[PDB]
Structure formats: structure tokens, C-alpha cells
Amino acid sequence: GRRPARCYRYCKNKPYPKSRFCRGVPDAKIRIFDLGRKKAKVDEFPLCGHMVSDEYEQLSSEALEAARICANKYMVKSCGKDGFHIRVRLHPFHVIRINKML
Amino acid sequence: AKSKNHTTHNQSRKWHRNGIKKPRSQRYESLKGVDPKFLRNMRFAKKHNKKGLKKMQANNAKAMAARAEAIKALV
Amino acid sequence: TGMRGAFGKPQGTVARVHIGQVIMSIRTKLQNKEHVVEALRRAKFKFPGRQKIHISKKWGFTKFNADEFEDMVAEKRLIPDGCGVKYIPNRGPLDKWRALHS
RNA sequence: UUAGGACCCGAAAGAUGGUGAACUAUGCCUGGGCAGGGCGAAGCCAGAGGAAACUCUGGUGGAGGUCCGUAGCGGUCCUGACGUGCAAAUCGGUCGUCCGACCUGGGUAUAGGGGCGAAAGACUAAUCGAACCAUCUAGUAGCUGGUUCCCUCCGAAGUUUCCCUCAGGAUAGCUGGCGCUCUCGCAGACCCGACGCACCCCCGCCACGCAGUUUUAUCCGGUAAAGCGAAUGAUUAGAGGUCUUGGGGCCGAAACGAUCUCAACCUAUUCUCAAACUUUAAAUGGGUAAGAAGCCCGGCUCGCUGGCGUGAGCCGGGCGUGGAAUGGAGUGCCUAGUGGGCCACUUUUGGUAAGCAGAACUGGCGCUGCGGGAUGAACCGAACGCCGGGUUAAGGCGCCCGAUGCCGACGCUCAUCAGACCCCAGAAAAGGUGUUGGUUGAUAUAGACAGCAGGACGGUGGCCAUGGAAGUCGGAAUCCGCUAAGGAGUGUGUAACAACUCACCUGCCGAAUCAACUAGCCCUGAAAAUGGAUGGCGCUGGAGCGUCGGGCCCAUACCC
RNA sequence: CAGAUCUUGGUGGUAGUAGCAAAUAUUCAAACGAGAACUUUGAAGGCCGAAGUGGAGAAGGGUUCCAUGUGAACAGCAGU
RNA sequence: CGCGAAGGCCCGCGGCGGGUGUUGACGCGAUGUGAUUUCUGCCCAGUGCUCUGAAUGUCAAAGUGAAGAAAUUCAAUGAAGCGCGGGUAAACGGCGGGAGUAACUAUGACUCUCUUAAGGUAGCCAAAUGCCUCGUCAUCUAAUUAGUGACGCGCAUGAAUGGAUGAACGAGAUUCCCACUGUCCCUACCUACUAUCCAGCGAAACCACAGCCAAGGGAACGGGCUUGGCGGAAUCAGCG
RNA sequence: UAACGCAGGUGUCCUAAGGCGAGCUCAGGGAGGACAGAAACCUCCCGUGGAGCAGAAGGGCAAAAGCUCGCUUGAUCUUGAUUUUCAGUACGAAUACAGACCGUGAAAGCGGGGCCUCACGAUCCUUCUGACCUUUUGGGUUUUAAGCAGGAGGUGUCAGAAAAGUUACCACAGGGAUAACUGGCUUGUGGCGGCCAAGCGUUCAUAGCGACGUCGCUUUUUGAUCCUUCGAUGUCGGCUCUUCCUAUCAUUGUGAAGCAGAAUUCACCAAGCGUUGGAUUGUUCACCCACUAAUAGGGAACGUGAGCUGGGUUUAGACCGUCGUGAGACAGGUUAGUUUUACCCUACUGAUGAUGUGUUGUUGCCAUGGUAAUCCUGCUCAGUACGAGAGGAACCGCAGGUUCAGACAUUUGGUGUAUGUGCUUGGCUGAGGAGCCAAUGGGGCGAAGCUACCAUCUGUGGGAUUAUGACUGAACGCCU
RNA sequence: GUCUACGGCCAUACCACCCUGAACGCGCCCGAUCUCGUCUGAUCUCGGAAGCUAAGCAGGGUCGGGCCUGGUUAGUACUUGGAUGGGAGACCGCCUGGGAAUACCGGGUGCUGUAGGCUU
């Protein structure tokens, strides 16, 4: 169903990463962590823009798929198609559990 | 039938309401567990000071008097 | 099932951020300051909570920083390799690196 | 603990021995009763018809577990009346059968694990899925209820292990009583401690001992943190180097000779992680040792130990208390209650969460009142004999209510939903030239931002798209001159639009102007069910919010 | 003794309240009498309407039968 | 289905005891189904019942032999019942699943196949039995989860644990039409006995104390407590 | 140091996989060699565990604890002590010792099972083994039995009973430590509303919607929980009745369009006022026919059983299907099935009376509480504005209606026991006449009275402002 | 200065290389009668001294990999104890005290006990 991200927003369990003891984990909805002109040498782009968190929270890998597209979808219209370079500095590792109780 | 499980948190008050935490350290702790081969001997060394009057302390008696005579000259 | 035994089975995957962690990062030319600063706030809306946005002092994605970087590249302590720059320390047998290349 | 009930009262049941068929169930003997009408079976007579079989028509006849229906017997519907009634099952209307398997009196039979049953577990003296009466009997019950005078002193548990154990017990634990062995001021008029004191101080003398503490010395671990160009695992992105490779191929030996070209690899780098990964690795924490149970010499003993050493144990002799702070320690019995727990700061597992379930440490509530939180287990202060005086903590000081009736200090805010105090019963992502501060970049006498002074200019519907586009779906394209001044074009609606119109600035007037971020308060975001709650009334130079002063109020606390 | 839906005995509020409504119906005069809606006589109006609100019996009751008298008590008001 | 009486079924504490039986197979006793009409399919593997038995596998009191000093140890011999073998379903009961195939596509005569002791035959229905289900089609209605009539792939229909049907009958269960009406639209009015008031006579349930509310907290729904709104003697008929 | 937390394993396996000693070194990789290949066998090199040690995982280990050889049975007999299981009780397992007899090794040493952590069992009873064993009841011999010590036969609910169902015919002790209703806390799920803005809306992100993401609210959905009641709160729906809410279907006032007019869609102040008649089903729900301005959603212990109904759940009787061998069960179908009490207090609607002005009476004022009116059609405006056209309204008037409210009896209808007057059946006073009885005999017509959307009349004026539109006008020389 | 035999600590002792050797002190080595084990006298065992430092070994070197000890990272992270501290909440500031680790940058590359030689 919906399972809105209000439920899994705080960080209230010990890390439970995808390993041999946790099978059946799906694949995260984000797969391409780098996009733009990736071959650009370090001489090229000296203005590194950051986004920094401010709450010790959890970000769903659902969001990272749409945050990557949303910021990419703008830059393409602004700079060009090989004028920038984007890297998601966060990886979804900590699988989160669900229970169907009807 | 269904019921609640335990909890354990007055374990420290009852603990120290009374209760001295030492085993009464003591001189002459009992010889319980020593090597029997070793212990047999120390039962013999005792046995040949507790037996008789002429053999052992006749040597003790002489040496003591020298301890008696030697020390007095200093005073 | 009546909650007689409720350990969840996995779904979805989440990533955690600490206060000060860096979520997303963008490289660009120095003339595209504004294109970065507002594309990120466009991305900021697909994330729970609030994230600060600022432009880094660090040249590109390198470990090294603002405009002292061009000296070392000239001084021959860094060399550009793809998306990054190698640090050339002096503990390595530079008498077998200078002998190789001054 | 056994019993005589065995604290008192309490079961559903079990056994022995007897009384009932006057209700009812059924068989039998012997007696009583059943208006009035319909339908019209056999059998009989006559008439007609036919060869006969026998067929038609009209009568007579009075059969039936037959029909309408009264007594009698029963009990369908109104789910009618009464429902502390007329009645512990009746009454009114409406109903079924009424010559038969019919209804009824009396006499006799069958009796409880038995009778009897056209069979519903029905009936057996208003009681039946085994009656009634007396006795075993005061039957057992980890299970409810109740337990009778005052004061004083002490005062818990809801946890361990085992149990056909989960509402109970045994066992540790916690609690009380009775003491006992010593120190000890119950120490004198002779002047103590390389050990403690009262006091000449202890001829007798445990000053030795011990702690929910720290100091000093030495051990111990693997949590937080951190790390992965450190092992295992997970994982992204480029660079460079040539082996099997391909896919596209070229030659036709053959092209990883070369060269394009991706690629599995290797090399150094890089992005991000781990409760069941870890090189490092804290805070807090766990034992020990802190002297007489010692320091030190001389001698003796051996059936073990062997260079001649021995390790242990015995005798004898000199030095006694040896880090800080606190008051006395040690020890033996008998033991009732408890073994349903709960809450909070923190640490923390399952869960979306829960006034949910489950754990560690500490403190609370139960067992506990008192001041404050308007009200309340558990929050803040504080622990209770009966009182007077004084001062306080937490709270507060418009009035309810003891206290600001200080001419209290600096500020912020208009709410047609203001705000008003730990736990707490006061909602968010997002917005606001409402308002008050801050940060950053600019521009202003080579003089500002306005407004007056001209406007989206023309080659030009450029070239094209043809998709219609003179600013528009959409196009590699997308300039010139003016350089005050206008993008081969930005918001409105469209037949291609006309049209509204989205900029730069000439001269004057002449000192502050622009933009973006940013936090404080206020506002929007903000929907629910009796009338409705910062505690109420009310409050706006505050009785609202922030940072703070003097003074003042009283608890069973502190002082006399 | 305060309790045990405690045992026995007693008394309240409820309360002068619910209630004295099944089957048509009584009225006038007179008598004894202290007293009369109710007893008795007379007059009238009604019903039970011969499967009876009639005349006799069996079970069962056991003196209720009949007469004289009484005004404690009972006859859910009263009463000769 | 049992039974020819030194018997079947049965009572009984016990006897040359008693009931059926003052009976005798056109009878007594034990069952199942339920008038008539028309039919009563396949399975004896399972669970029972019964029938026989030499060469008998197991088999207990006696009884017989062997060794021992004896108690005893051993062996052979060995009835009924079991084990072995027949019958019986109007005895309890039970009665399949896959593919492929005809001239458009859907269906399947047919063929292949695995598997039981048989594979549900005659009939019948979304029925008192059909979860999906308010099945699909038609009828009656303007509108019908209901009734009816067909269809059958029927979770889970079916032959005496009877199937199907059918004139008469039923205080049995359902649907519709004609007539009728206060059931209703929409309530009104009339009568009798009460209710009501008076004289007389007069009970019982019940009762911690008592009885106005809103919000708060609380054992998480207060009549009492906190903050408020407020409050007047004594009462009569009603009311839920 | 806990939960029906997590990822797993055991009831076994070994005469060697135990005990020694010796000699080697593994996994993996590279380069070379007849067949020979990526994958046999031969050689060299690199090789800190990357292999193996029975199995679960952790720990441990390279001249071993791994591999291969040679010999053996320390897996033997007997005392005690100690550790792990929070009773410092057992079993089990294990560690140091000691007394014996041995194994291997020249040797020092090691070894009384497996490299460590699990692989297991009381009393009673039976069975085997042991000594010149004890007893066998007045003495003796023998057979037999009883003893003492040590193993085995097993209780897996594993500190250890010998044990099948149903009860809807049920019973008793109790339980809110314990379920079915509300009432609580949460909000997954259900419902509703925002933010961002890729697009859809031929043109264009935002007239109307809005994916990828994210934030909340509500308790009218089902859940999760067990706090209150099991010495009883009567548990589904429908009928009747009141009030309340807004998240508004229609009505009054308004904003916007891709809005010409008509119809419409999004929104604001807004709960005053309305939101229907019916077939089927027990229905809440659903689906339909019809009218209408619309046929909006809800709450009050899932309102409302001393208000009713009892249709369906849900007792006892029954039949069918399925299951069970059987009693019986179904969270499948059908049928028949007792609904109790008000007079108490309170509230509520009515009705006497109360304190005070000396006592009475008349005529009136308003402090307060209640509140009430709502909706539509037709004519005209007008076939006009608007539109190519098809189509097509409003404001002011005129006339009437639906819903509701208050009355009234002139008319119409109903009532009727003025028991009024006739007709009339059966019986009864001898008959005529006049009458009576039949619970009001029956039936005509009916005064007064009470009554009906079934007849009749009447139903209203201002003030303050909200939404929105504006005037003047700064902050900010313009502009609002 | 150093070696040999037996060792303690067990990498500052290792590993890759390159350079030089202080009596055969250790080794390389020449053979297989005997002791002894092999497919092989390569290993193991046994008998010697013709040569040899080339190799082992030792000493040194590498702006070496490693390794030990320091420094910055940092008084950052983390945390014992307190509050009627902020925040709806995630969390955060403060007082009291304790207090780390990579990146990066330097320094170091065996000490030694007993017995026995060598002055090459």
C-alpha cells in the first residue's frame, strides 16, 4: 500500500543492513548515483555545490530517486547536457521492516 | 492463563539492607585440597616433632641457650 | 495473525543522515553559481525535514580546497586523473619518481 | 502438621437404607357419554336398449379411522389481556377433532440406573439429561466473603531454583523477637598514644575491624566513538597498464603488429556503510594491596623434592598498628507476610504507534501523609509525636487568595481563532515588501533608486516549421543600428492574432537605493458532533513573550 | 463487633401510595335496632333461561346441618 | 435377520425360577424404510456378520513324559478366539483426475494416459441441499437479492441412510391475482370498565448517604471532588 | 540479565575421527611437459592460515591440534578435592591432583576418550559382574531367596503420573489476571486537505487536474491494546422523537474559467432552512422506477428494547449437505420458537401554593428565557440581451402553489347512545294502542358538540457587520 | 668490532632488492665401505677436507613497502552527574568532570643472558 514515510522517519532501530542474515530484501528504487558529464577532468568544474542535512533522520530510497531526477531535470535545462556533474553522496543500506496484521 | 512476566529491580536494596561482603579472612585456613603426596610428608614432619622428647628438642634446647647467652653480653 | 509472533519481513530500503552529513553534491563552472543554489532547493522539497544549502570551499570533488589548489598542480604535488586528483606525497621513493619524472 | 468441622460459613457430585403411580406414562378388569345437517359405497325394484356380453335412466338402500358443526377432549394466531396476576401457567376473540387409533370415574400392575415412553430426553405428587426422605457428613475446595479493644517500638515482597507449576506450594531473599562474645566513659588520688579514647589513664584492656565512598599502584574488557588506498562482507565513479575477450570490423595468414571500439581483468585513486565485521578504542565500571595475618634473623624436623640446593612445617629472639573521612563490631537460634506489581530520567528489543508488550541502573508509588502543579498514585519541594516564635525550598504576589498599592529596568507583538509556565493535556511540510533585527553583493557627486521623457523599435511574418507560430506547439537557427530605448522575443486569450503589455535609460527635481539569504514575534496553513474553559473573571505603557533586579507571602522542612 | 447477599427478633422511608375494574343492575317504602348504600318484608325493574346462577347424589370435608343469643376477633368497606 | 421348544429374544441375588406362552413359522422376537404409480445401478477392497477346519502358525487350567535330592527347569501333546479361505451392501457405508482431437472461432462423438474395490447409472436442482451467488436466460412489476420455468462445468444432489412423481388432506413453509378493509396516506369521534377526586380498608419490590448541570482530572462516562453556571418551603396528574 | 526477538544446531557419529612418535604442509595462483583440453599426471616458484580438524557457530592451530606412516588401547581399576548450573542441592559435563597397572617415545614428556564450548537420566523393580563376603530366624550341609559395591533396562511433559472425545441438555466454585459490546491511547488501513511542479489541458506548469516524493487532520472504516464492568450496563436492524456538527446537495450574498447566452465546473462568509414516495433483501449497505430547487455526509454508550417490533443472529424440537467410526460440529441453508416491574428521586410537560410590601382588589411596565417561516411554478419583462445560428435568461411587478406554524366550525365531510325520530327481525305484558329485553338488537336520517390538507382565515419591521466590491491615502516622491 | 652453541623479549628482529666480508667460526662442498632411508645418498644418515664466498649468514644502503614511537586531526567526537534549559518534535546549547581514532606530517630499523673463539 501507501506506507507513507511518516512512519520510518526517525532513526529508532539498530542498523540492519542487507546481509546473509536478512534475505529477501528488494532492490532500492535508486540505482544511478552519478549523472551528467562524468568524464570531466578536475580542471573543468571548480564550483562544488553541496546539500547538507540538519536533522538526524532517515531518508527513504524512494526519495533519492526523485530528488536526483528533480535536480537533474533542472540543470539540463539551465547549463546544458554536459555542463554539470551530480553525485548522490548517500547510499540506502539499512533495510526497514514491515508487518501485515489484518 | 495469560499473564505478565517478571521484572528484577529491588535486587539491590534487599541485597544491601543487610549483608557483609567479606568471607571472614582468617589465619590457619584448612588444608582441604592440597596435593596428597605433598601433604603426606608434611604430616610426617609434624609426626617426628610430636613424637618423643629426647631426639628433637635436645638439639633445640642447646641452641636456645646459646641464643640466651649470646644476646645478653650486648646489654 | 493476532500478533502471536511479530517480527517484520523486509520491504524498501532507507539511508540515515547525521547532523552535518552531506546528502547531494553538484559540480559546475564558476559562472553557474545561481543554477546550483536554486536547483538544490528545488530538490529540497522531496525530502523530509529541512536541509541547508551552501557552496563549498573545496575545489571540485577533491579533498583539497579553494584557491591554493592551482599552486600545487603547478608545484607538481597533484596530478589530474579523471574525476579526482592523486596526492603525490614525499614518503614514496620520489628519487625514483623524480628520476622517473621531475 | 494430623485431626475432634479444625478460623467460620459455602459447593456440582458419591454411597448405604427406605417412602411414593392422589399428577402423569402405559397394559389390564369394571362402569358412563357422544345434538343437528352434507356427501351417498355395496345390496334391491322398475323403465328403456341389444343376439348376448350387459349398457343407460329413475328410485330404494345408509357404508365411512368421510365432511360443516354442539357437548367432550385439546391449545393455532392475536407473539391480545394479567404479567408484586384470578392463577408459581389463568382469561377473551379467533381455533383442531368430534363413531374412532374417541373422552372419562373406580379397581389392579410396573419404582430410581429403575418404571414408562405413537420417541419430545417427555412423564414419575409444582422437582427429571438418573425423584423424594434420613444417614455416611460439620463430605473435600490452590476458590469468593467475614474475622470483634487501646497505645508504644520495629517493619517487607511481588525476585532466584524446582514442581501436572502459572489464581498454589518448597527453597533462597527481604522482616521481627530472644539473646550471647568482646570494645565501651561502669575510665578513682598520679601525672596516656612509633596503637584508640574517655581522662592521671584503661593494672584486666580486639584499636585490631568493617563500609552501595574517594586517593595512590597494578591488572581486566571490546560498548559509544572510529575504520575500511586495514582482514570478511557490502558498494559508486572516473583515470592508466596489457592478457583471454568480443561486438562493429579491415586484410583473406593475422591483428589484444598497429589502429579504431567496448570489455572481463591488474595498477594506483575515489563515493558510502555493518547487532550476528574489525586494526585502533575512551567515559562510566569490575578484583585486588595499602603492615603485628607483618618486617627481620638463629636453630630443628621429612617416607616428597636432589649440585652441594630443598619446599613446607615447627621452635626461639628484636622492631607493634603503617593513605584521607565516618561509628562500636562479631555471632547463634525461631521465624509470620511475600512470591498478580506499577511509574519516571537514562540505556534499550518487537511494533507505525499505543495510557502496548519485554529487559539493565537508580529513585519513586504499593506502605506515604504535607507546600506547589486549579483538579490527579508516579512530576517539583519535602519525609509526619502535641505546640508557640523566626526563616525558608518548589511555587508565586490584578481580584477569586497570603504576597509588587516597586510610580521596577531594556526590548518584541495586533490577533474578525492573540498569548499566558517541567511531566501536561499549548499540531506540521510550507508561505507572508505584517513587523524588528542580522549576513552577503552591489550604487551615489566620472550624483543616486523614483517621477516627469521617450517605449516592446525597424530591415522583418528574419530564415524556417509548414506543425497552422507577425513574442508562442516546437527548429541547427535567432543579428544588426539605436548603443536613452526594446528579447528575430516573456506573463493574458487564440483563426495565423489584432489587442493588454513583461525591459534600458537621455534633462530636472537631489540622499540614501536595490536584491538574495536569514532568524525573533504575529498571521495563513488549522475540519465535528450537549454550552466550554491559560482554573474563572479578565487582561493590551500588560494581568502577553525574552533577559533580570529590589521587596514580600507559608509546609507537618530548617533554627530556638 | 459495622460489615460475612451473616442467624433470630423489631421498626421505618416508600405510603394513607399501588390497589379493593372478569361474567348487563339496581331503585322506593317499611321493621327491629343505638346505629342502616349491604340484614328482613312488601312494590317495581333485571339476569341464570332447563348442555341453568335449578332439584338430587358419588369421591372428598366431619358437625359446617337446625334453633336461641353475642357484638372481642375473622368474613381484605360495612353489617341488626 | 434369528428360532422346530435340553430352542429365538429377554427378566432374574438365587432354584425342576419367570415373560413371549391359554403361544408353534399365515407364529414370536430384532431391525430399516414409509400410502399408491414407476425404478432400486456399480463396489466384498475397509469396517462388521456368518460359514469349515487337520496338514493346522499362535494358544491358558488340568493331564503326560525327561533331569534333579526336592522346590522346580525342560519337552511333546494342545479346545474356543485369532491368523488362513468362501458369502453377503433393502449390513455400516463409498462411487476419479489429466492432455489432444470434426470445414472460421468457440463444444466434443473419438483417441492417448495415470490410477482405485467400483469410478455417480436411471433421475433431479442454484431446490429445505450451489461457498462464487443478487449464477445466466424468460415471465409477472414502472422498479423485484423474493416466486416461478429452463440451463448444469453439481465446494457438498442421487436410488429403501430411498430417487422421481402425484388426486385428496394439513391451525406446516413461500409468491401472485380478484374482493375487502383505519394496516396506511392523516388522524377523528362515540360507548362500557378503569385511570382521576371523596368515605372505608390498605400492602411489596427497593433503600451506603442522597439526588440540578458544562468542562477537567480520575479506575480513561461524577449526584459528591476542582473551576465555573447557579440554588428557594410544601406538593397533585403525567412521563419514560 | 526478558519476550511466540533474531540467524542456526542436537537426541547422533568414531577400533579411529582415541594415545603416542616420526616425517611432511595446506587453500589458492603463475610459468613449463606426448596424447592432455579451463578441468587427470610430472616439476619449479609465490603462498600467515586465504585450507582442514564429523556436524551448528564462535574460539584455537604450520617443523600442529591439518596430511601420511609405525606401534597400541590412558575409552582400563580405586579414593577423595574443585569448577559450571544465581538454592552454592542433584544429574550431566569438565579441571587439577593421588594410589594401581600400562601405551608410545632413545628421551624429557604426553595420555585415565574425541582441540574447548552440547550430544543426556532419581526412588521402587528386573538383569549382569565381585569376594573362600554377610543372612537365610534351635544347630549343620546343600539348592533357593535376601543383602553390600559397580554397569545396564527410562521416564524427550526430559528433578522423572500410567490415560481418548462430545455436551446447543449441561452443572458448581471463581475470574474482568481472561475474550464477544460501547468508553479509552495509537492511526497501519479506510476518508479528507496541503507543499514541490515532470507533464495533461491543440497554444500554457497551476482555468480544471497533477505522477515521482513529502507533510498533516479526522475517529463516520477495519485493525493493534486489555485500563473499567463476568455477585450481569439487556448484545443487529426498522418505526417514532429531539438536538448538535460541517468536511455544503439545493436556497440568500459573492469571487474564477479555456465564461458569448443556457447548463456548468473550483472556491469564500455560511448549518437559518429543506434533503422525498416505492419494488427486492432481516438488512446497515446496494441496485433500480418517479417526482423534485438537491434527493449532501455525519455524531449523541456504533442515540433510542421498564419506547415497540423480534425479520436475523444466538438455547432447547427438527430436515438437508459436508466432516466424524460415534456422541456431535459447521466462523454453510431452512422452519417453529414466553421480550418482565414505575407508585421512589431527578429531569421534562402541565397544575395548586410559597416568602415581601399593614390586608385585599384592579390596571399595567420589562429583567430576563423561547423564537418561525421556508421553497417553487406560471404571466409579463421577451422569443428580446447574448449569439452566424441552433438555442436563449435576469432585475421591478401580477397571480398562485409545496413544506411548516397558529387557530376556527359559516359551508363540506366524519362522529353519533340528545338512545332524537321513523323502518324492522325474535320473544314478552290476553289483543289494539303504548312499550320493553337481546352486554348499544339491526339498519335508515340527524341537532349541539369535537373535529380533517377532507372544509376555512392568518403568518411581518429595523440595526451591527462577515465573505466580496470600493472611496480617500501613506509606508515606498509613483502605486494601492 | 664480530662470530659459534643454547636462549629471554618475539618485526625497531619482517619483505623486496643492491653493495662488502674480520682463520673452513658457520656453510657451500668431495664420496656411499660400514650405521641408516629413500623411485632418486637431491632430503635423512654416515666418511672427509680438493676447492669456494658466488649462495646461506653477518654489516650497510632504499628521500622503499612494512613495523614501533611521536606530532597535527582536537579539547572535535563520545560520556559520568544537574536543571521547572530551548525545541510540537527529530535533536541541541550549557554547568560539572573524564576524553579518543583515520587522512596528513616527522623520528627510529634490535636490546641482551651464560658458555666458547677471532684481531684477517
Short mmCIF file of N, CA, C and O (backbone and C1' of nucleotides) in Angstrom, two decimals, chain G residues 21-24 68-70, chain H residues 32-45:
data_model
loop_
_atom_site.label_atom_id
_atom_site.label_comp_id
_atom_site.label_asym_id
_atom_site.label_seq_id
_atom_site.Cartn_x
_atom_site.Cartn_y
_atom_site.Cartn_z
P G G 21 54.33 -37.33 21.48
"O5'" G G 21 55.49 -37.77 20.49
"C5'" G G 21 56.47 -38.71 20.91
"C4'" G G 21 57.06 -39.47 19.75
"C3'" G G 21 57.30 -38.67 18.49
"O3'" G G 21 58.48 -37.89 18.56
"C1'" G G 21 56.30 -40.74 17.94
P A G 22 58.62 -36.55 17.69
"O5'" A G 22 58.99 -37.09 16.23
"C5'" A G 22 60.04 -38.02 16.05
"C4'" A G 22 59.96 -38.70 14.71
"C3'" A G 22 59.81 -37.77 13.53
"O3'" A G 22 61.05 -37.21 13.14
"C1'" A G 22 58.28 -39.56 13.33
P G G 23 61.14 -35.68 12.69
"O5'" G G 23 60.81 -35.74 11.14
"C5'" G G 23 61.34 -36.79 10.35
"C4'" G G 23 60.54 -36.97 9.09
"C3'" G G 23 60.07 -35.68 8.46
"O3'" G G 23 61.08 -35.07 7.69
"C1'" G G 23 58.28 -37.21 8.55
P C G 24 60.92 -33.56 7.18
"O5'" C G 24 59.97 -33.72 5.92
"C5'" C G 24 59.25 -32.61 5.42
"C4'" C G 24 57.95 -33.04 4.81
"C3'" C G 24 56.99 -31.92 4.50
"O3'" C G 24 57.26 -31.32 3.25
"C1'" C G 24 55.86 -33.66 5.63
P U G 68 45.33 -38.93 5.67
"O5'" U G 68 46.80 -39.53 5.47
"C5'" U G 68 47.36 -39.69 4.18
"C4'" U G 68 48.75 -40.24 4.25
"C3'" U G 68 48.93 -41.43 5.18
"O3'" U G 68 48.55 -42.65 4.57
"C1'" U G 68 50.66 -39.85 5.56
P C G 69 48.57 -44.03 5.39
"O5'" C G 69 50.09 -44.47 5.34
"C5'" C G 69 50.59 -45.46 6.22
"C4'" C G 69 52.01 -45.18 6.61
"C3'" C G 69 52.49 -45.90 7.86
"O3'" C G 69 52.93 -47.21 7.58
"C1'" C G 69 53.03 -43.61 8.03
P G G 70 52.11 -48.47 8.16
"O5'" G G 70 52.85 -48.79 9.53
"C5'" G G 70 54.23 -49.13 9.54
"C4'" G G 70 54.81 -49.04 10.92
"C3'" G G 70 53.91 -49.52 12.05
"O3'" G G 70 53.94 -50.93 12.19
"C1'" G G 70 54.86 -47.44 12.63
P A H 32 79.79 -42.62 -4.78
"O5'" A H 32 79.62 -43.34 -3.37
"C5'" A H 32 80.62 -44.22 -2.87
"C4'" A H 32 80.18 -44.91 -1.60
"C3'" A H 32 78.95 -45.80 -1.76
"O3'" A H 32 79.07 -46.93 -0.91
"C1'" A H 32 78.50 -44.09 -0.18
P U H 33 78.81 -48.39 -1.52
"O5'" U H 33 80.12 -49.20 -1.13
"C5'" U H 33 81.10 -48.62 -0.30
"C4'" U H 33 81.53 -49.55 0.80
"C3'" U H 33 80.54 -49.76 1.93
"O3'" U H 33 79.60 -50.79 1.65
"C1'" U H 33 82.67 -49.25 2.82
P C H 34 78.18 -50.83 2.41
"O5'" C H 34 78.54 -50.69 3.96
"C5'" C H 34 78.87 -51.83 4.74
"C4'" C H 34 79.27 -51.45 6.14
"C3'" C H 34 78.18 -50.88 7.03
"O3'" C H 34 77.33 -51.87 7.58
"C1'" C H 34 80.13 -49.56 7.23
P U H 35 75.75 -51.64 7.63
"O5'" U H 35 75.56 -50.48 8.69
"C5'" U H 35 75.77 -50.70 10.08
"C4'" U H 35 75.27 -49.54 10.89
"C3'" U H 35 73.86 -49.09 10.56
"O3'" U H 35 72.86 -49.85 11.21
"C1'" U H 35 75.29 -47.22 10.57
P C H 36 71.54 -50.28 10.40
"O5'" C H 36 70.97 -48.91 9.83
"C5'" C H 36 70.29 -48.00 10.68
"C4'" C H 36 69.84 -46.78 9.92
"C3'" C H 36 68.93 -47.04 8.74
"O3'" C H 36 67.57 -47.22 9.12
"C1'" C H 36 70.64 -45.55 8.09
P G H 37 66.56 -48.01 8.15
"O5'" G H 37 66.11 -46.91 7.09
"C5'" G H 37 65.27 -45.84 7.49
"C4'" G H 37 65.01 -44.90 6.34
"C3'" G H 37 64.41 -45.51 5.09
"O3'" G H 37 63.01 -45.71 5.15
"C1'" G H 37 66.23 -44.16 4.49
P U H 38 62.28 -46.54 3.99
"O5'" U H 38 62.02 -45.46 2.84
"C5'" U H 38 62.39 -45.72 1.49
"C4'" U H 38 62.82 -44.44 0.81
"C3'" U H 38 62.80 -44.43 -0.71
"O3'" U H 38 61.50 -44.20 -1.23
"C1'" U H 38 64.81 -43.45 0.08
P C H 39 60.82 -45.27 -2.21
"O5'" C H 39 61.93 -45.50 -3.33
"C5'" C H 39 61.81 -46.56 -4.26
"C4'" C H 39 62.27 -46.13 -5.63
"C3'" C H 39 63.51 -45.26 -5.67
"O3'" C H 39 64.70 -46.02 -5.61
"C1'" C H 39 61.83 -44.34 -7.08
P U H 40 65.80 -45.73 -4.48
"O5'" U H 40 66.54 -44.42 -5.00
"C5'" U H 40 67.25 -44.42 -6.23
"C4'" U H 40 67.51 -43.02 -6.71
"C3'" U H 40 68.33 -42.14 -5.78
"O3'" U H 40 69.72 -42.34 -5.94
"C1'" U H 40 66.43 -40.95 -6.58
P G H 41 70.56 -43.21 -4.89
"O5'" G H 41 71.15 -42.14 -3.87
"C5'" G H 41 70.29 -41.34 -3.06
"C4'" G H 41 71.04 -40.40 -2.15
"C3'" G H 41 72.24 -39.69 -2.77
"O3'" G H 41 72.33 -38.37 -2.24
"C1'" G H 41 72.95 -40.97 -0.91
P A H 42 72.92 -37.18 -3.15
"O5'" A H 42 71.79 -36.05 -3.10
"C5'" A H 42 72.04 -34.77 -3.65
"C4'" A H 42 70.80 -33.92 -3.69
"C3'" A H 42 70.08 -33.72 -2.37
"O3'" A H 42 70.67 -32.73 -1.56
"C1'" A H 42 68.51 -34.33 -4.01
P U H 43 71.20 -33.10 -0.09
"O5'" U H 43 69.88 -33.46 0.72
"C5'" U H 43 68.94 -32.44 1.02
"C4'" U H 43 67.71 -32.99 1.70
"C3'" U H 43 67.92 -33.72 3.02
"O3'" U H 43 68.08 -32.84 4.11
"C1'" U H 43 66.41 -34.94 1.65
P C H 44 69.16 -33.15 5.25
"O5'" C H 44 68.74 -34.56 5.82
"C5'" C H 44 67.62 -34.70 6.68
"C4'" C H 44 67.47 -36.12 7.13
"C3'" C H 44 68.73 -36.77 7.66
"O3'" C H 44 68.98 -36.45 9.02
"C1'" C H 44 67.75 -38.20 6.08
P U H 45 70.48 -36.14 9.50
"O5'" U H 45 71.21 -37.55 9.42
"C5'" U H 45 70.73 -38.65 10.17
"C4'" U H 45 71.45 -39.92 9.80
"C3'" U H 45 72.97 -39.81 9.77
"O3'" U H 45 73.54 -39.93 11.05
"C1'" U H 45 72.22 -40.90 7.82
#
